[PDB]
Design a protein around this ligand. Structure first.
Ligand code: IHU
Ligand code: IHU
Ligand code: PLP
Ligand code: PLP
Ligand code: GLC
Ligand code: GLC
Lengths: 791, 791
């Protein structure tokens, strides 16, 4: 009740924060509420983990280097059914709950979609009552805080743990040793890994509350600790550096030794903990291991788990190779997230030989047995051997981590129908021919808790008033909103909810940027990590085309827009940082032009993260999902926008294909080249200058960027962009330009008719049910992990 | 009460530790009790700090680089009067309180006497109800954990904060910036220190409960925080390294740049915090500053506080030099703890110019106004100018921090009557001649809470049963125990308390060391930091003399002894490490000799720290305080042993003189040369060869060490010890040998007469009253700080 929540808050402010109402800060009030909310899940947290020990169901271990959790206060209150009572408790005490919630730092331990998928999955697995654990690294610094200085991206350290974290709880008794370097000794006692450097792994447990049930699961994150005198003590920082910072690479492989250290650190600590828990349970002694343990590999990042489990089985537990291999394959499952060559992990053998010598011997041994099996099936095909090998012998010998994951797992999955098909029939064609039942599809999803109930209370309330509150546990029930198709009362209520969200977010934009936002404008948003494949550059070419159309004929009819493009660029990604400079330079010319005025405003939304995503998404009218066909594995941003009342402009890529299947192709703004048309242009050879010389609209845009219209001080500034666009554009920006601007004209035409726009929005929300991560998890549960959703 | 404490423990185990009785650890139980005990302090902690804000009494700021606090649980339970109730509550829950207490890490943020004095002072200031604050550094690693491997000292990092500290609380709102490096500009708007490197200072508050009163003061400890991308984030460790580790130097100056960074870090953060609190209180505005603030400099370590207070006053607060200097002198007071030349802080001007350019300018200007006065008073004395200068011109220019401290303070004090005299009349003679009223004496003391009530509940109970409990707050009441000299039953009750403590500690010695302890043996103990001045070597010579006496005549009457020598040696101190190996080598030969047996046992007490001092001191019969006359400033270990029922064997050095004055010289075992006799041997010339050939017992001892009787596998191992003893011994070990062995024979004779021994013990305990830190703090309060005790 309300009275006990106030009493608990006051008890925490006094005893935990050591303050009275006279000198307490807003931060003290946030902590007092956080501790009060955490206290309310303790009973269910203990009981859930006790239940798993007592009944011994098959456990699911989600092993990831990334968990993009965001803020947990409001999420926990909603899932526990305590939001209304806490809101009232805080009000009665004369405080503002929005002010307290804003103090919380995001647990930004992820780069983008991959890390967010892991977070949505934890929420879904707990809601479904599965015996699931999330395993990762407790990075002291998550994804950097982004600032825009003089039009460029600047990085600031994300010191999220500065003032503490009230959600985590250290588990001292489960501290484990992780070994590095050393050498291999082949004695008569067996194979030993000696002379190693030890780094301790201290686990921290964070609660994962299920939506309105009695389940509270665990996310276990590991922190690295160390096991002239002053210098020896200062050098302890080197061991602790393993869990210091998240590598800010999204869909890009950077082969640094510290990243390999992180990957092994989480793998070794996690596997030892899982084996310890297995041995402590009610269950030669490992025959029942895959019937009790399922470990999911989120990308190839924790691929080292395969030879590490083999190392524990063969070297420590003394199990013979063949049995150890059978058990390993049945335990692991791998999820592929990209087909891009630069995003694939290929670790140099020399680096792995130095850091993990025993693991390299095991990888070689796995490759030996794998290749000997292909010789027995195909003796005359010599090229299939080097193509299927885990080792790439060309010049500098590297280990293909994707191939290691395929041979060491019983199931390999993609993240959307179109993607899983390319993974199966194209990229790993040789593997899928040998074992057809290994490769499968698991279309991505998002949690309707954080991505609807939390972020958009207005739309959540609207839907509940019309079709009932049953849609949260079964999102397919959103189809019942079709009963209101001709109803002008509902279409006006839907637009009013969108307007309330737009007005709230416009207040944020005017305080952070010097801009006068037009309240009647179409919120055109592209928020995702900055990449050449995601094509924020194509969006920028359209913003310039619109600017050039207004300057040509000022008194002509133009549908007002607020173009918001946001996202972080990897610090070492030159081209992405150039795209950001281009967007901010275009923004300064468009926003300060008196002829344009309220017709078009451009905003580069700084520091795009989970909490900001929660604010921008419900305020969006148009969603930009313009990646080149065959490059975006799935995308999850697309599903968030669809659930929140926005229309989608995009290519037939990733999950956009499935969104089009569910809502009806005519209900999305699909344009451009499809998978076959991109492949037909690769065989012919991409000549970018043809589109520049054929389309006059594109010529003026590119000339303005090349001459220095957007940069009068530095006319040679965007030359790296021009040289890429003409000779090295693997993502064919100019090839999709015409179809894009024509499609954007159709979006503008529909916005002028509120009734038709909102009828299309209704069809998108009503068909967004398949995109619940609850659906995605039920499929992984039935066809991969072999676990049953309990209530 | 008991039932309420059990409920609170259970509540904490559930909500704070997330555990039930089935999986709860010993660590979990400690934390649950710790939080239960801390909760009982909260109300009085808020009320005490609120009282200081509301009434504004004169505040005392004890500024120190060291706070050797030890464990907090038992101390807090005793000071709040909850120990008996907690012991009962824990027993009823089926647990042992002593087991839970052993989990707590010592807050070993000190080296020895200097840091322990600061800790005793905090306990005393809070007991007397003074508005006092302790200000230091929250070292991530305190004094190293000492391990003995192959007879040598090995250092291990003291990772005291790994599992958390329940006795601290971060104060986010009081985070302050500290500046380093940069350059100085003297503009028309005042002097500006610009282009600096910033390191943030985050304060952590720890409660300091007064004994059985309403006062709970604060100990504020500062932690350093920082304000290729990956490398930039990792390089944040460099700023954090300032508060990483305590410099393990006891009475030794090591001129490392990191130590200077630490000294300024604590000073800047402390002074900025004091000024903020002053300006935020009820009532030019800085005229009342010295009447509201008193800052005590614990050694020269925080000497930079003088030019820093001048910097804030002149550069930031825009006060003129003359007024700024007047206030600075009346604010500061300096406590000298050193006698040795190598212990004095003499920082190179080049190091100070690079790091703190503005402070050097202020130090130069202080020196100029200082030297101009000496030219105006004594014109024809040019040698007095270079002697009194804050700058040493000899070779590479250095700043004499002791001279800076004297001129910038209104009061200077030594720590014992003999020390203060040498500080006044000899070392700083030139300063005392100009200002006699500045130099004072403040004889050291120890808190009877930790050093009697805590460590020796049996003796504390016995004393309370006879004379009441008023002695805890006024230790001079122990004089009433003189009335019980002819009381045979009380003498027997006193002897039993000692035997029960010896039995309890003998259990510790049998568990940690593989040695059989004789219960009827005399516990001969020398525990303090290892140094040549303290003469652990002189003790070692006597141990070998006793060994030889048993080997020459096995049937002779020998009084059994258990000689315990313990203490840490500084890592870079070679001679101290050689002395440790000599003791362990002697131990292995003596303990394993069948002809000796239960007659003599030697133990090198490993990892001597505050918690271990609490165990060994109450179990001691003979206290060794054998430093060379004129080398130990005071000593505090001497006082702890006297209060705990042990007799003292020592020289007339430091506070040993005053212990003899209080108890009667015939009641202590005083030997050797005094201050005047050491000076007479320095004048003639010390020849250690004379005492070697004149004494036959010393000849056998030195031949055994040089020939390798204690090191058969390495005959030339103790070559450095023999070379030092004969040619380079500034502490004249051989000159005190004869008088020491003769005095030790007298100790042995008295031990054979329990009635005479215990009567002498009673005369020592009954006269230990002056040595309470309450008496010391009352004198600092009256004669230096101008504050009044209240309740
Ligand atoms: C200056 O202290 C206060 C003055 C007036 C008040 O109404 C309250 C306070 N202080 C207070 O409420 N708390 C503290 O002072 C405090 C906070 C944190 C901590 F670790 C220790 C304390 Cl004693
Ligand atoms: C394995 O979990 C348990 C099994 C049986 C029990 O009687 C109790 C437990 N667990 C328990 O009491 N607590 C926890 O499991 C726990 C401890 C710390 C933390 F951070 C989270 C949890 Cl859920
Ligand atoms: C959902 C989400 C993403 C993934 O977006 P895509 O558009 O699918 O790449 C990235 N970042 C944040 C902060 C998100 O919430
Ligand atoms: C009291 C004490 C000291 C100081 O001892 P002296 O014998 O005075 O040098 C040093 N270390 C510890 C741990 C102490 O308790
Ligand atoms: O699978 C989760 C996400 O992983 C990666 O971020 C992919 O680029 C994205 O398409 C996918 O949605
Ligand atoms: O003043 C406290 C202590 O400071 C130093 O440690 C001195 O060496 C010691 O003699 C003194 O007792």
């Amino acid at each position: 009740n309300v009275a006990e929540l106030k009493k608990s808050f006051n008890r925490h402010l006094h005893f935990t924060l050591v303050k009275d109402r006279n000198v307490a800060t807003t931060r003290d009030y946030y902590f007092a509420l956080a501790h009060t909310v955490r206290d309310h899940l303790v009973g269910r947290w203990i009981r859930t983990q006790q239940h798993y020990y007592d009944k011994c169901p098959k456990r699911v271990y989600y092993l990831s280097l990334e968990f993009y959790m965001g803020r947990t206060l409001q999420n926990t209150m909603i899932n526990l059914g305590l939001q209304n009572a806490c809101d009232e408790a805080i009000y009665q005490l004369g405080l503002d709950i929005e002010e307290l919630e804003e103090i919380e730092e995001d647990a930004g331990l992820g780069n983008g979609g991959l890390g967010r998928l892991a977070a949505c999955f934890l929420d879904s697995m707990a809601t479904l009552g599965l015996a699931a654990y999330g395993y990762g690294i407790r990075y002291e610094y998550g994804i950097f805080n982004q600032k825009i200085r003089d039009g460029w991206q600047v990085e600031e350290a994300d010191d999220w743990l500065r003032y503490g974290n009230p959600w985590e709880k250290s588990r001292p008794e489960f501290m484990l040793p992780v070994h590095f370097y050393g050498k291999v000794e082949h004695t008569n006692t067996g194979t030993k890994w000696i002379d190693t450097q030890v780094v301790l792994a201290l686990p921290y447990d964070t609660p994962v509350p299920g939506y309105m049930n009695n389940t509270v699961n665990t996310m276990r994150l590991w922190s690295a600790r160390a096991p002239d005198y002053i210098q020896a003590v200062l050098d302890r920082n080197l061991a602790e550096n393993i869990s210091r910072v998240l590598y800010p690479n999204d869909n890009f492989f950077e082969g640094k030794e510290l990243r390999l250290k992180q990957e092994y650190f989480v793998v070794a600590a996690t596997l030892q903990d899982i084996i310890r828990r297995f041995k402590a349970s009610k269950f030669t002694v490992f025959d029942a291991f895959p019937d009790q343990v399922a470990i999911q590999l989120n990308d190839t990042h924790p691929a080292l788990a395969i030879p590490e489990l083999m190392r524990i089985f063969v070297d420590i537990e003394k199990l013979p190779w063949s049995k150890a291999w059978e058990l390993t394959q049945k335990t692991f499952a791998y999820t592929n997230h990209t087909v891009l060559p630069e995003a694939l992990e290929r670790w140099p053998v020399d680096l792995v030989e130095k850091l993990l010598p025993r693991h390299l011997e095991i990888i070689y041994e796995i490759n030996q047995k794998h290749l000997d099996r292909i010789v027995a099936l195909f003796p005359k095909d010599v090229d299939r051997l080097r193509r299927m090998s885990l080792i790439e012998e060309e010049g500098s010998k590297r280990i293909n981590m994707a191939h290691l994951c395929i041979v060491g797992s019983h199931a390999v999955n993609g993240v959307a129908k179109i993607h899983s098909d390319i993974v199966k029939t194209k990229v790993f064609k040789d593997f899928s021919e040998l074992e057809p039942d290994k490769f499968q599809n698991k279309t991505n999803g998002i949690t309707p808790r954080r991505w609807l109930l939390l972020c958009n209370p207005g739309l959540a309330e609207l839907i509940a008033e019309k079709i009932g509150e049953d849609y949260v546990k079964d999102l397919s029930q959103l189809t019942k909103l079709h009963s209101f198709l001709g109803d002008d009362v509902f279409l006006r209520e839907l637009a009013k909810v969108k307007q309330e969200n737009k007005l709230k977010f416009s207040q944020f934009l005017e305080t952070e940027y010097k801009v006068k936002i037009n309240p009647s404008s179409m919120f055109d948003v592209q928020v995702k990590r900055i990449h050449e494949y995601k094509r924020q550059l194509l969006n920028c070419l359209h913003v310039i085309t619109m600017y050039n159309r207004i300057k040509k004929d000022p008194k002509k009819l133009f549908v007002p827009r607020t173009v918001i493009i946001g996202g972080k660029a990897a610090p070492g990604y030159h081209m992405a940082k150039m795209i950001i400079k281009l967007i901010t330079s275009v923004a300064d010319v468009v926003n300060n032009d008196p002829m344009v005025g309220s017709k078009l405003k451009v905003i580069f939304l700084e520091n795009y993260r989970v909490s900001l995503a929660e604010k921008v998404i419900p305020a969006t009218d148009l969603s930009e999902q313009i990646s080149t066909a065959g490059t975006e594995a799935s995308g999850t941003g697309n599903m968030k926008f669809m659930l929140n009342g926005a229309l989608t402009i995009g290519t037939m890529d990733g999950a956009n294909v499935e969104m089009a299947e569910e809502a009806g192709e005519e209900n999305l703004f699909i344009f451009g080249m499809r998978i076959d048309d991109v492949a037909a242009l690769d065989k012919k050879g991409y000549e970018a200058k043809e589109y520049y010389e054929a389309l006059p609209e594109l010529k003026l845009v590119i000339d303005q960027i090349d001459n220095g219209f957007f940069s009068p001080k530095q006319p040679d500034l965007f030359k790296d962009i021009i040289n890429m666009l003409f000779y090295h554009d693997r993502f064919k920006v100019f090839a999709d330009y015409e179809a894009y601007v024509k499609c954007q004209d159709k979006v503008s035409q529909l916005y002028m008719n509120p009734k038709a726009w909102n009828t299309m929005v209704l069809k998108n929300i009503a068909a967004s049910g398949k995109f619940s991560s609850d659906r995605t998890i039920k499929e992984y549960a039935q066809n991969i992990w072999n676990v049953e959703p309990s209530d």
